[PDB]
Structure 1
């Protein structure tokens, strides 16, 4: 084993690799949403930029796990980054619903990794997750839920004026 490795279970190492892949996958989904809202026949630029920013943040999340793996003496093992589930995202409401579910999927995986770390008596990995991941998730889930509520209030999907107004006054 690595000269640096201490109290780092093989199962946790492997789980870190899978979580890395899922972060990359989330990043890629967000990128797809950015491109959709930038289409000339969609044209909701502030919504597009919101998703672009989320893509960038997810990539940063992935990078932090790569660094973490190496710090602990694990070995980064990469897999294919699966394309997003859809090629087109409907409208702001449908996209935000999909984003909420993605954020919740990522959060579940983080929580599962925390449980594993707990089971394996790895406080360093627990702290990493708590300090760098779990609160960001909660915040983003809350933000996206709030947006959903507002999009419904504004009459989505049918009310295009409502969708326009959201793009112009919510995505800040």
Structure 2
């Protein structure tokens, strides 16, 4: 029995492990999305950079969750990482929609975990998630939504031209 563990439920410990898996898998998805936009027959460098930076941020989220698990006296447990949902990611709007779907699923897991900690009366967990995760998610999702609106407006006009202009002038 842990020499430091206090007010830390087995349910929260398990939930944090699942969330690590979800962050790792999102990182993997972004690695894939990034290298797809690096293909010579896709060739949108700004889009590649966008998603590769997101891969690093998700990996950072997982590491932060793992650090907290140990701080609280929980034990990190890792599961297999399922490969990303697609091998090819279509056009800029397809990939940005996919990204928002992924982020919304992360945000919901965060929200579920926050509801669990609140039901378990775990204020440290609730402060940890609010400080480092919940606002970062809101801000990123807003940014993605802004990007989708701009991409959609551009590719309604002329699809190839619009995609090029967005990568050049926004990304």
- Do these two structures clear the TM 0.5 threshold for a shared fold by scoring above it? yes
Q: Report what 1:44 is aligned to.
A: 44
Which sections of structure 2, spanning at least 5 residues, go unmatched?
Answer: none
Q: Report what 1:86 is aligned to.
A: 86
Could you list the per-position Cα deviations for residues 14-56 of structure 1 after superposition, in whole angstroms to 9, with x for gaps in the alignment? Answer: 0000000000000000000001000000000010000000000
Q: Report what 1:167 is aligned to.
A: 167
2-structure distance, mates of 1:158, 1:128? 45
Q: Report what 1:5 is aligned to.
A: 5
Which sections of structure 1, spanning at least 5 residues, go unmatched?
Answer: none
Could you list the per-position Cα deviations for residues 46-85 of structure 1 after superposition, in whole angstroms to 9, with x for gaps in the alignment? Answer: 1000000000000000000110000000000000111000
Q: Report what 2:14 is aligned to.
A: 14
TM-score, structure 2 as length reference: 0.98
Is the deviation greater in 102-111 or in 154-163? 154-163
TM-score, structure 1 as length reference: 0.98
Q: How many residues align?
A: 171
Could you list the per-position Cα deviations for residues 131-158 of structure 1 after superposition, in whole angstroms to 9, with x for gaps in the alignment? Answer: 0100000000000000000011002596
Task: Tell me if the contact between 1:156 and 1:163 (Cα under 8 Å) persists in the aligned partners.
Answer: no
Task: Tell me if the contact between 1:19 and 1:109 (Cα under 8 Å) persists in the aligned partners.
Answer: yes
The answer as to 2:152 corresponding to 1:152 is yes
Q: Secondary structure at the match of 2:79?
A: coil
